[PDB]
Design a protein around this nucleic acid. Structure first.
Lengths: 126, 37, 128, 69, 176, 136, 138
RNA sequence: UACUAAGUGGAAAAGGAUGUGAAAGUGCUAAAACAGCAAGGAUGUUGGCUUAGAAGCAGCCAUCGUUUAAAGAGUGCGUAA
């Protein structure tokens, strides 16, 4: 119920706090085959790939001590690449996937909490 | 459009309409539709 | 798009594949020489439905859904899971699961073994 | 993927190179001749290395400058 | 739901006046007229950039009124600001159409000439002999007119030859 | 089809089906059951038609029990005869059911196919059937 | 006749058989407006007769289809370019080859089964069969 | 004071029904639940009898697992599979 919602909000907020790097990106017609391909690209990598509920997502990023309180966790299939622990490999892989398609919808987040544009991200990661 | 006395949904689409206060059973196909069933 | 699985001895069989828009001799020779090391066996192929359709065909390793009969040293894949047909050592099953680990959604050898057990459920013989 | 492009001809065999461009897939006289009249012209793309290797083999057997990847 | 269906008003040129039997909608695409039924327990209040309707009682038919009149107002607005159109694909061998004045006459399967009258507010255009576009003024008028056009001949499951609405498909039946 | 062994008298009263359930007034052996909302008479042919319907829709397993056995019999007075020569000629056997009587019970292949089979059985008899579940 | 589409025929021949059939002459009209032929070997020939062929109307090739000829012309000699190298030299030069020469080349092709010509006409309308007879003789 | 939409009243049933109204309950949700819509809706896997193939799904017999938020040897339609 909502108590479990709050408990999971606290858990994922703590996970985000200890894993300072986390970036959320949405993409059009999210197919299962391409999701499997990108997930297999992050083999044995802590980052998780899913879509979580928008309400619980906004509550989590509210309680996650992260940039913003409720900004973009609405209006679209909220694909989430929850960066966990090491997020350099995750950052490079998700950015390569972003450049792979026509354009991936930059929702929010950063590689270690201090927002910069993705053009800056692809060059700092390099 | 069949005539019966016990309507039961045979196909996926076997909906009913009391159109002009007269009951017609209709289906996506032209065969499974009914009348006064 | 459909799935296909046929003999590796020759890619010439299959009229549906030749009618996609790719020359018969093209994929025939290409597959037959890409499987020249090991052919004359059942192999699952995958191809797409492209407009130009010059060559968009690739193969996969030998299917593992009823292939445990190869490891079970028997044939006649059972319809019903009522009796057991034989025994397979767990070492070989785990080695095969690792051998097919990279292919599928499984990310560790254990998940591939779970899938092997799931597909062996029907056969009547489980991972033993 | 590896492709092959025909550079400057040898023996100036316009007929022969036109037939070479025809034998790739069974193209007609008009399009093949227009392609040949342009010195840079790709034969085919999206093919495996072996068949492109035989394509280049024919191209060097007939005789012409050959550009490949 | 539709009992709670907000209709935004565009007073740029689309202005609505109410007579309890005639609702007039002025806009760029001519003018729409809605024949309000008599003695309605529903109040259709116009306001700033929005239109709100509310029943003054609690009746089963009042909910149907709430849905239907909201639907009618929405259709009137969209018609007076954009209108509606249909694309008709006439799949045949010798089948074709051409218009003279207000009479569209046809070359179809009968040995008899075919003619039909075109109502006002429904502009038809025949680019190629087998394609027609019908830009209507209301979904009711255009739908009924399209049904009248297709009632002469319709495609069959054995063969598709007739006035397709450019969005339908047929099945295949064995013709020996 | 289902008849008694010996009959000391072949000619009882005509029959009356009035009254409420006296014996077998409930379901006591199955998991689902069928009850009659009105007292009627069930002859051999309809009983066998219902039984074969149940057997066909039962599948491979399924346990069924009738709460009664066809006991009563009917007589037919000769046709095109004038009034009064005795009684009728003995005829088919029949079972009497009263208003509100549970007649049949099922188990083994549960409630989905149970209700399907019960409908199959009841669609052969004039009685306005009523499906129930035996409670434990 | 309804359904007699020139494109349908000239595509179906190659799809079903692929015999490199060369369409020589071009019609004028589509099953109702059929009124003559755009000759390739010679100038256009109008046929106003709806039956019982008696006269052929010699006319210059229509302007809007000159290019329609040229492409096919640039193919037709090219289609008989598989017989000699001098024809290819002329094609490179762009020099026109004599109509009699290309006619004999098509004759050699058809008798040798290298290719086969295609002509148009309607039996119920009797248009352009004199062209067929001329081709048969030549 | 409730009901009517059948002129039921003002003849009849086997039957069937989101007909109407009332009552007794049972769950979630304004964070926006449900309907619709923009989508995805996947792999081992075309499991085997067999239809001069078993292939998702003529049918028949088993009737699981992996990632996922999601996917059922599949929910069905439908295809020669």
């Amino acid at each position: 119920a909502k108590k479990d919602k709050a408990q999971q909000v606290a858990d994922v907020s703590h996970l985000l706090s200890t894993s300072a790097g986390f970036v959320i990106f949405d993409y059009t017609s999210m197919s299962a085959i391409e999701a499997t391909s990108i997930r297999k690209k992050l083999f044995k990598n802590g980052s998780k790939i899913k879509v979580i509920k928008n309400n619980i997502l906004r509550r989590a990023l509210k309680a996650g001590k992260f940039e913003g309180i409720d900004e973009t966790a609405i209006k679209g299939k909220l694909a989430v690449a929850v960066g966990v622990n090491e997020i350099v490999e995750t950052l490079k892989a998700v950015d390569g996937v972003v450049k792979a398609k026509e354009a991936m919808n930059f929702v929010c987040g950063y590689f270690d909490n201090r927002a910069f544009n993705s053009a800056d991200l692809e060059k700092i990661a390099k | 459009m069949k005539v019966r006395a016990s309507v039961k949904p045979i196909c996926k689409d076997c909906k009913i309409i009391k159109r002009h206060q007269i009951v017609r059973v209709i289906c996506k196909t032209q065969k499974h539709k009914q009348r006064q069933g | 798009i459909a799935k296909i699985n046929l003999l590796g001895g020759q890619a010439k069989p299959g009229p549906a594949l030749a009618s996609v828009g790719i020359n018969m001799g093209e994929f025939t020779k290409q597959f037959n020489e890409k499987t020249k090391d090991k052919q004359g066996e059942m192999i699952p192929c995958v191809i797409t439905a492209y407009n130009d359709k010059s060559f968009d065909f690739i193969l996969k390793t030998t299917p593992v859904s009823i292939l445990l009969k190869q490891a079970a040293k028997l044939e006649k894949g059972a319809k019903n899971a009522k009796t057991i047909v034989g025994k397979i050592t767990m070492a070989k099953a785990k080695e095969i699961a690792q051998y097919k680990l990279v292919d599928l959604n499984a990310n560790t050898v254990e998940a591939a073994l779970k899938m092997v057990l799931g597909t062996a459920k029907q056969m009547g013989i489980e991972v033993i | 993927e590896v492709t092959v492009k025909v550079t400057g001809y040898t023996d100036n065999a316009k007929l022969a190179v036109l037939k070479l461009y025809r034998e790739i897939a069974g193209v007609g006289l008009m399009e093949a001749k227009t392609a040949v009249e342009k010195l840079p012209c790709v034969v085919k793309q999206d093919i495996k290395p072996e068949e492109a290797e035989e394509l280049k083999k024919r191209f060097v057997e007939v005789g012409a400058t050959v550009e490949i990847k | 739901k539709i009992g709670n269906r907000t209709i935004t008003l565009d007073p740029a040129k689309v202005n609505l006046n109410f007579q309890k039997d005639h609702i007039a909608v002025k806009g760029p695409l001519g003018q729409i007229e809605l024949k309000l039924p008599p003695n309605l327990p529903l109040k259709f209040e116009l306001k700033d950039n929005n239109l709100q309707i509310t029943r003054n009682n609690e009746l089963k038919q009042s909910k149907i009124f709430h849905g239907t009149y909201n639907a009618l107002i929405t259709n009137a607005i969209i018609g007076v600001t954009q209108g509606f159109e249909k694309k008709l694909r006439l799949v045949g061998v010798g089948y074709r159409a051409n218009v003279e004045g207000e009479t569209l006459n046809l070359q179809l399967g009968y040995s008899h000439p075919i003619k039909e009258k075109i109502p006002k507010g429904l502009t038809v255009k025949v680019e190629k002999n087998t394609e027609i576009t019908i830009s209507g003024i209301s979904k009711e008028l255009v739908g009924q007119f399209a049904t009248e056009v297709r009632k002469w001949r319709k495609p069959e499951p054995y063969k598709g030859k007739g006035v397709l609405y450019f969005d339908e498909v047929i099945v295949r039946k064995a013709g020996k | 089809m289902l008849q008694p062994k010996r009959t000391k008298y072949r000619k009882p009263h005509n029959v009356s089906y009035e009254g409420k359930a006296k014996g077998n007034s409930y379901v006591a052996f199955g998991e689902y059951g069928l009850v009659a909302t009105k007292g009627n008479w069930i002859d051999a042919r309809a009983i066998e038609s219902a039984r074969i319907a149940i057997s066909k829709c039962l599948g491979k397993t399924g346990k069924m029990w009738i709460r009664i056995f066809p006991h009563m019999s009917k007589t037919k007075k000769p046709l095109e005869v004038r009034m009064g020569s005795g009684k009728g000629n003995p005829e088919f056997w029949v079972a009497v059911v009263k208003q509100g009587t549970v007649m049949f019970e099922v188990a083994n292949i549960p409630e989905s196919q149970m209700i399907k089979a019960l409908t199959r059985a009841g669609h052969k008899l004039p009685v306005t059937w009523k499906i129930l579940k035996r409670e434990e | 006749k309804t359904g007699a589409n020139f494109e349908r025929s000239v595509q179906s021949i190659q799809q079903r058989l692929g015999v490199k059939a060369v369409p020589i002459q071009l019609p004028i009209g589509a099953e109702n407006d059929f009124n003559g032929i755009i000759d390739l070997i010679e100038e256009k020939v109008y046929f106003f007769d709806g039956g019982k062929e008696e006269k052929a109307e010699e006319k210059p090739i229509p302007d809007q289809f000159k290019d329609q000829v040229k492409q096919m012309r640039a193919h037709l000699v090219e289609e008989v370019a598989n017989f000699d190298d001098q024809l290819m030299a002329d094609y490179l030069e762009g020099k026109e080859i004599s109509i009699a020469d290309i006619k004999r080349c098509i004759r050699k092709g058809v008798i040798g089964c290298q290719f086969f010509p295609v002509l148009c006409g309607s039996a119920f309308k009797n248009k352009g069969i004199k062209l067929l007879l001329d081709a048969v003789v030549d």
